[PDB]
Design an enzyme around this catalytic site. Structure first.
Site, mmCIF file in Angstrom:
data_model
loop_
_atom_site.group_PDB
_atom_site.id
_atom_site.type_symbol
_atom_site.label_atom_id
_atom_site.label_comp_id
_atom_site.label_asym_id
_atom_site.label_seq_id
_atom_site.Cartn_x
_atom_site.Cartn_y
_atom_site.Cartn_z
ATOM 1 N N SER A 298 59.159 83.632 40.817
ATOM 2 C CA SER A 298 58.632 82.768 39.622
ATOM 3 C C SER A 298 57.298 81.844 39.881
ATOM 4 O O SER A 298 56.750 82.124 40.910
ATOM 5 C CB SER A 298 59.787 81.919 39.702
ATOM 6 O OG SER A 298 59.728 80.666 40.484
ATOM 7 N N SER B 100 56.773 79.070 40.577
ATOM 8 C CA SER B 100 56.570 77.914 41.775
ATOM 9 C C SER B 100 56.240 78.721 42.924
ATOM 10 O O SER B 100 55.774 78.122 43.928
ATOM 11 C CB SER B 100 57.957 77.276 41.818
ATOM 12 O OG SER B 100 58.887 78.036 41.743
ATOM 13 N N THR C 235 63.898 80.348 36.847
ATOM 14 C CA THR C 235 64.350 80.649 38.215
ATOM 15 C C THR C 235 65.756 80.602 37.938
ATOM 16 O O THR C 235 66.400 79.560 38.271
ATOM 17 C CB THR C 235 63.852 79.823 39.221
ATOM 18 O OG1 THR C 235 62.318 79.495 39.146
ATOM 19 C CG2 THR C 235 64.369 80.043 40.700
ATOM 20 N N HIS D 143 49.228 111.971 94.479
ATOM 21 C CA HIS D 143 48.056 111.503 95.492
ATOM 22 C C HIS D 143 48.476 110.131 95.903
ATOM 23 O O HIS D 143 47.688 109.658 96.925
ATOM 24 C CB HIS D 143 46.583 111.451 94.909
ATOM 25 C CG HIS D 143 46.201 110.437 94.279
ATOM 26 N ND1 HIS D 143 46.287 110.359 92.841
ATOM 27 C CD2 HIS D 143 45.612 109.226 94.737
ATOM 28 C CE1 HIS D 143 45.903 109.165 92.486
ATOM 29 N NE2 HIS D 143 45.399 108.321 93.523
ATOM 30 N N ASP E 18 48.293 116.198 89.115
ATOM 31 C CA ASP E 18 48.499 114.866 89.953
ATOM 32 C C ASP E 18 49.987 114.125 89.513
ATOM 33 O O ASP E 18 49.735 112.913 89.295
ATOM 34 C CB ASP E 18 47.306 114.214 89.929
ATOM 35 C CG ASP E 18 47.337 113.081 90.892
ATOM 36 O OD1 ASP E 18 46.446 112.133 90.709
ATOM 37 O OD2 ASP E 18 48.124 112.992 92.036
ATOM 38 N N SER F 227 46.949 103.841 89.816
ATOM 39 C CA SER F 227 47.272 105.225 89.732
ATOM 40 C C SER F 227 48.553 105.390 89.668
ATOM 41 O O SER F 227 49.422 104.861 90.500
ATOM 42 C CB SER F 227 46.528 105.615 91.297
ATOM 43 O OG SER F 227 45.272 105.868 91.060
HETATM 44 P P1 LIG Z 1 44.516 104.902 92.076
HETATM 45 O O1 LIG Z 1 45.307 103.494 92.430
HETATM 46 O O2 LIG Z 1 43.366 104.398 90.668
HETATM 47 C C1 LIG Z 1 42.186 105.224 90.288
HETATM 48 C C2 LIG Z 1 42.775 105.978 89.405
HETATM 49 C C3 LIG Z 1 41.317 104.104 89.997
HETATM 50 O O3 LIG Z 1 43.675 105.647 93.314
HETATM 51 C C4 LIG Z 1 44.161 105.827 94.444
HETATM 52 C C5 LIG Z 1 43.219 105.357 95.558
HETATM 53 C C6 LIG Z 1 45.508 104.635 94.736
HETATM 54 MG MG LIG Z 2 60.817 78.599 40.676
#
Ligand SMILES: *P(=O)(OC(C)C)OC(C)C
Ligand SMILES: [Mg+2]
Ligand code: NA
Ligand code: NA
Ligand code: NA
Ligand code: NA
Ligand code: NA
Ligand code: NA
EC number: 3.4.21.47
Length: 480
Positions: free
Chosen positions: A11, A13, A86, A250, A300, A423
């Site tokens: 409305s 308002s 309203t 790794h 990895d 990592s």
């Molecule tokens: P990651 O913790 O981190 C990198 C990808 C920058 O590397 C290993 C050495 C732990």
């Molecule tokens: Mg109203």
């Protein structure tokens, strides 16, 4: 079964801007409700002198959040006529009609009224609520069935009549059903009163976003990993199931013993014990020295199996994995969706907006980056040449295998770079309010803990699916 009735005052308002702002709240609600895997039937009504029904709970499409959102988006303030009046009583009667029957007792009803409380027409609206409760047989047998109705009122604008608004809203102990729209704390609280967390604990890529949440609430899948040796190593990982944590290979060595490895999740003081570490069979950090590659991070990835089975809570949840039924549902896609389709959706040929988590002095922060997966890709990859011990690599495409994703750089934006400790952490894509892991932080071009070539490489989980599918085949994750 649940029906949510969106009733919005349009409305005089109210005004154009705030009317628009009101729709936004409703759009976000629909979106957040959907992200929990909940599919209610929606009713969409606007009103002034008379109500205008844009969606009825009985329409098949009323339970399609995308459709209802589309409708709500097409609604224009000027669409509703006769703004001089309203009649909230009427607006509520339109809701009544939707409930009226010309398994009813198992359907929950939630009314969300957005008005300034100033009805200058019709009788007292409380009447209709009474009628509605009567119709739903609520407050009859002292089996009350109070849980089947909720009347929420969102006061719109600066000149609101708190009395009338209070009058129509439900009155349940330990709960709030009235909220000024500008008040976001209140609106945030309402949501958690409406949706049942318990029903979504088995959902991947979920996050409890409430303002009171901690770092563990915001990154529930995050798992910190310690390795005691020589120097002690630190790595991140992600919970992919109740028994597994995905990380980088790794981060360990065949010389690290099970007991020297500890895992930490959910903000718990204690550490967890693992059963064994499963490295990807193709991971061989020394397999390419001859080709001029000292450290080789192809494949990895590693899966840490915990000794004890985890339980999902608000601080410990699994993240979604590529090509699984969890990701399909998280993405709100039909059960006929393919791995390829998920890929085209999660990883398109272009600069993909993604993020990763990093520990910054006790606190976990989100680092937004972009995955160069378009015509800017090859360029990002080449930058690997400036990496330590890679200045004589024969063919660079030999180090940046088809398993890597490339982030970092100055374009399209100044991406932040992973630091030692990240990592193994997940590289994530945020879609439909859900979180999907697409990569595992592996290695970087530069130690920035910057140059236009400070790049980061991640393992594209799509390129290791056969392995994941094999190692997690019993984690009830439903791989495609
Ligand atoms: P990651 O913790 O981190 C990198 C990808 C920058 O590397 C290993 C050495 C732990
Ligand atoms: Mg109203
Ligand atoms: Na649609
Ligand atoms: Na009663
Ligand atoms: Na719960
Ligand atoms: Na708690
Ligand atoms: Na499915
Ligand atoms: Na791919």
């Amino acid at each position: 079964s649940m029906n949510i009735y969106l009733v919005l005052d349009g409305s005089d308002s109210i005004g154009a801007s705030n009317f628009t702002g009101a729709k936004k709240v409703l759009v976000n609600l629909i979106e957040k409700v959907a992200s929990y895997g909940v599919k209610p039937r929606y009713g969409l009504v606007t009103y002034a002198t008379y109500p205008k029904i844009w969606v009825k709970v009985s329409e098949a499409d009323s339970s399609n959040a995308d459709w209802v959102t589309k409708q709500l988006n097409e609604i224009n303030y000027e669409d509703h006529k006769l703004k001089s009046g309203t009649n909230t009583k009427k607006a509520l009667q339109a809701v009544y009609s939707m409930m009226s029957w010309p398994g009813w007792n198992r359907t929950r009803h939630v009314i969300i009224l957005m008005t300034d409380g100033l009805h200058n027409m019709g009788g007292d609206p409380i009447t209709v609520i009474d009628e509605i409760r009567d119709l739903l047989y609520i407050g009859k047998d002292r089996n009350p069935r109070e849980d089947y109705l909720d009347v929420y009122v969102f006061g719109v604008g600066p000149l609101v009549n708190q009395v009338n608004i209070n009058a129509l809203a439900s009155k349940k102990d330990n709960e709030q059903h009235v909220c000024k729209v500008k008040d976001m704390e209140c609106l945030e609280d309402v949501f958690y009163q409406m949706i049942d967390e318990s029903q979504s604990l088995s959902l991947c890529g979920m996050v409890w976003e409430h303002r009171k949440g901690t770092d563990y609430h915001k990154q529930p899948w995050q798992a910190k990993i310690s390795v005691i040796r020589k120097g002690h190593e630190s790595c991140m990982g992600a919970v992919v199931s109740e028994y597994f944590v995905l990380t980088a290979a790794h981060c360990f060595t065949v010389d690290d013993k099970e007991h020297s490895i500890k895992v930490s999740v959910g903000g718990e003081k204690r550490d967890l014990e693992i059963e064994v570490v499963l490295f990807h069979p193709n991971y061989n950090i020394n397999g390419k020295k001859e080709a001029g590659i000292p450290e080789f991070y192809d494949y990895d990835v590693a899966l840490i199996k915990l000794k004890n089975k985890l339980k999902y809570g608000q601080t410990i949840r699994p993240i979604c994995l590529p090509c699984t039924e969890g990701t399909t549902r998280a993405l709100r896609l039909p059960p006929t969706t393919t791995c390829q389709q998920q890929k085209e959706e999660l990883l398109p040929a272009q600069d993909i907006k993604a993020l990763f988590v990093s520990e910054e002095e006790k606190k976990l922060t989100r680092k937004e980056v972009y995955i160069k997966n378009g015509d800017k890709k090859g360029s990002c990859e080449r930058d690997a040449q400036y990496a330590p011990g890679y200045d004589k690599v024969k063919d660079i495409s030999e180090v940046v295998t088809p398993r890597f994703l490339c982030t970092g750089g100055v374009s399209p934006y100044a991406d932040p770079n992973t630091c030692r400790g990240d990592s193994g952490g997940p590289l994530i894509v945020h879609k439909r309010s859900r979180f999907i892991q697409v990569g595992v932080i592996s290695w970087g071009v530069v130690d920035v803990c910057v140059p236009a070539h400070a790049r980061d490489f991640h393992i594209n989980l799509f390129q290791v699916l056969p392995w994941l599918k094999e190692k997690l085949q019993d984690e009830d994750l439903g791989f495609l």
